[PDB]
């Protein structure tokens, strides 16, 4: 048929075509025939010049508002004359111009993705809008360089592009929690027009880290004389997760025997291990037990650590003197060398702290004899006369080889008859 | 020195040794010398027979209560005589018997392990107790066959065994949530004695599964006449996690345009997509949008699904008759063939539903002429005489080719002069 191209957004009065000449109307009859555009809308947008017979633009036309996403926009125009009454038809092709840039409906997009999202999961993106059609519509999407995310641009049945964010590699909030990316959409105009949007993705924390001790195990030496309330060690553990999932508390293992809990206490927040009671190298020389650090996650991650506390001997025991047997009363006629008492000594300490020596004052008529290790018998070493002295109080003194030495004193009472 | 072996837990009166004969004491002097055990404890456990001079057990001896975990248990015994007063020493070796079976302090142990525990993490176990020493103490640990856990048995500085549970492969509560294992501890006695304990481990859930749609995408066809409240589709998605982490809810994507939300609604629990308003094939022929299923986990996992709804044309529009120009009044002298009116018809439906035919009753002196598609002019087809009839009401009827057809009626009023 008769087709006139005219670009959209053309100014008022732009020449479309000589409709009178294409309808073969006589020039001299323009004022009588009263050629008019039919249709209220087309009379709003088109008019016929009465003098030349040319079809002119009255009000500028928006192709986007007229045809939307249709590929071709052709507007059939109807014309009317009188005398005689006649109708004519012609087609105006409205040509699209590139007066729309791609534009994201939101220029700021925010995503919250869980740290444990599986690779391959997809996330929708808002496509930019370009009201044009054909080569002037959106032609490509671009995603800035990053290491975990890529673009998966989808082609719809009509030719629309749909960008999707594809997680390619697993995330880790503990290494990087925020990503700032730019998404760009470009049309195929000349020159190409484009628009961008900032996509801020934050990684939500999963409790995927257990607490970590500074060392795998600790070994401690402490003197058995250490006072109650002494800090033996401060355990340090870190947990990189966020919030309560990064909150560390310390405790004894659940199966920790009572003999350990009675002597040691562990501060739940600071991890300071303190001493709660008396230690004794003589009964127990070392303790090994496990402690644990738990985070406040759901479910909780825990890590255990092995502790060994070695005790150091202190010279805290003086010798103990036991008089096994005692004559008590003795006749003055007894010959020198008579065994008067049996004495055993013991010292629970080790090394020089437990080596016992025994002594009595010299001026007495008695002597100490030893036939077995740490065993002494007290015997008569001189003559005895009841009339001179009727009774003896013999002071025996035991000493260990500690520094300073510890001494024990015991008196054996002996009557003479 | 003088050493006598005697087994622990020996009955009263068991022969240890002839101490008198080893101390070279005369048999005839037993009642006078009054050989006695020294020490209250040893007098509780040992006695000397006055007639034979043999050292005998008074009360049975527990080696475990005496030496604990020491490798060697040797008890120095002291003896005393009178007339003259003398002291002797000898050593009794108490030999351990295998009168203790390994026994776990708890025979039921329960562990709660997070599903996302990393392989290589270790978990303490309560070691069994065997009060014996040497080869009679605990000699081995065994863990029943399973696929995720193994045993890491530790050797302490003193020779104690510490069993630890080692996670070798990652867990998955969604495949198996409970493990029943038996831990066995065996000593090295003849015969070996052993004891077992049941360890029930439960796997605590992590929200590591997103909801899964039945299909990756759905495509729906619906007639534009479908009534409001019609269910177009029921979306089904499953989530295998536990509790709220397995609770699925449905929604439109956050970026879903308002033109979609106005026409369709999605039940958050059931996933039924219903129709909320009028559809119109003539203005919009299809809709594509994304819906998402989110679980109630922290953080939430989500999965999207693409929906496309195609509309089907219904013959819901009758033709529209527009009378472009109308003479209104006509002289009776006008020749036949005079164009009286200009008529244009349009039907927005497609195919046969939008093909228009036009007609008027036959007996009238008028006719319909068509020079362009869907355009008709009403012209005079016979002679006219005002005196016969002074005015005409001409009923024009348009019909589409639908089943059933839709009709439009319009009357043009024409005066004759
Ligand atoms: C557990 O941690 C505490 C605290 O350590 C703190 O964090 C670490 C990472 C470092 O930055 C450290 O400087 C911080 O205080 C440890 O306590 C500290 O341990 C130091 C040994 O590396 C120790 O030197 C320091 O005490 C000082 O020592 C100086 C002599 O070297 C003295 O002149 C001074 O007066 C202090 O007495 C100590 N500080 C405190 C406040 O405790 C602790 O050792 C860690 N535990 C384990 C088992 O490693
Ligand atoms: C979403 O799920 C529903 C419900 O499905 C239920 O779970 C699945 C795993 C099956 O066990 C199913 O039997 C359960 O009802 C689906 O609804 C059902 O879909 C069936 C198609 O597979 C459909 O046949 C059924 O309707 C019946 O159809 C029969 C004729 O084949 C009729 O004779 C009968 O009267 C029903 O009209 C329907 N049932 C219900 C209660 O809806 C639904 O299709 C799924 N959606 C998608 C998109 O797959
Ligand atoms: C980190 O946690 C501590 C301790 O939490 C306790 O142990 C948890 C495993 C769980 O059992 C909680 O219910 C316990 O509260 C928090 O310290 C507490 O702070 C409050 C004051 O706000 C105080 O009244 C409590 O007594 C404290 N708990 C203890 C055991 O002393 C601490 O607030 C947490 N850290 C942060 C940053 O919130
Ligand atoms: C599964 O969840 C539903 C819905 O939970 C809602 O959506 C969540 C994502 C979150 O926003 C919640 O705060 C919402 O409640 C539960 O259904 C609810 O049940 C209560 C009665 O107990 C009812 O009053 C609410 O209205 C319901 N919610 C809706 C949206 O209708 C349901 O109980 C959960 N399943 C289980 C097994 O607990
Ligand atoms: C968007 O991208 C286009 C081409 O990629 C540029 O021409 C424009 O300046 C904007 O950066
Ligand atoms: C893409 O980048 C431009 C700046 O070049 C912004 O204007 C836009 O908002 C988006 O960040
Ligand atoms: C424990 O194990 C020992 C040897 O392994 C057995 O002898 C005993 O019967 C029990 O099963
Ligand atoms: C090991 O197995 C035995 C049964 O043979 C139980 O007695 C014990 O409690 C543990 O289950
Ligand atoms: Ca425009
Ligand atoms: Ca345009
Ligand atoms: Ca454009
Ligand atoms: Ca991590
Ligand atoms: Ca943590
Ligand atoms: Ca984390
Ligand atoms: Ca002591
Ligand atoms: Ca000591
Ligand atoms: Ca001492
Ligand atoms: Ca015993
Ligand atoms: Ca035993
Ligand atoms: Ca045993
Ligand atoms: Ca899993
Ligand atoms: Ca889930
Ligand atoms: Ca799970
Ligand atoms: Ca319609
Ligand atoms: Ca229709
Ligand atoms: Ca129709």
Author numbering:
A (entry chain A), B (entry chain A): 1 to 417
Can you provide the manuscript's text about this entry?
Clustered protocadherins (cPcdhs) are a large family of cadherin-like proteins named for the clustered arrangement of their genes in vertebrate genomes. cPcdhs play roles in many facets of neural development, including circuit development, most notably neurite self-avoidance in vertebrates, and tiling. In mammalian nervous systems, cPcdh isoform expression is controlled by the unique organization of three tandem gene clusters, Pcdhα, Pcdhβ, and Pcdhγ, with each cluster containing multiple variable exons, which encode full cPcdh ectodomain regions with six extracellular cadherin (EC) domains, a single transmembrane region, and a short cytoplasmic extension. Moreover, Garrett et al. discovered that neuronal survival and postnatal viability are controlled solely by γC4 suggesting a function that is unique to this isoform (although it presumably requires β and/or other γ carriers to reach the cell surface).
The biophysical properties of C-type cPcdhs pose a number of interesting questions: Despite their more divergent sequences compared with alternate cPcdhs, AUC data have confirmed that C-type cPcdhs αC2, γC3, and γC5 form trans dimers using their EC1–4 domains. However, γC41–4 behaved as a very weak dimer in AUC (KD >500 μM; Figure 2—source data 1), nevertheless full-length γC4 can mediate cell aggregation when delivered to the cell surface by coexpression with a ‘carrier’ cPcdh. However, there are no published crystal structures of C-type cPcdh trans dimers. Right, close-up view of the gap region in the crystal form two dimer with the side chains depicted as sticks. The intact crystal form 1 γC4 dimer is similar overall to those of the published intact alternate α, β, γA, and γB cPcdhs and the published δ2 nonclustered (nc) Pcdh trans dimers (root mean square deviation [RMSD] over aligned Cαs 2.4–4.5 Å; Figure 3—source data 2). Comparison between the γB2 and γC4 dimer interfaces highlighted two buried charges in the γC4 trans interface, E78 and D290, which could potentially contribute to the low interaction affinity.
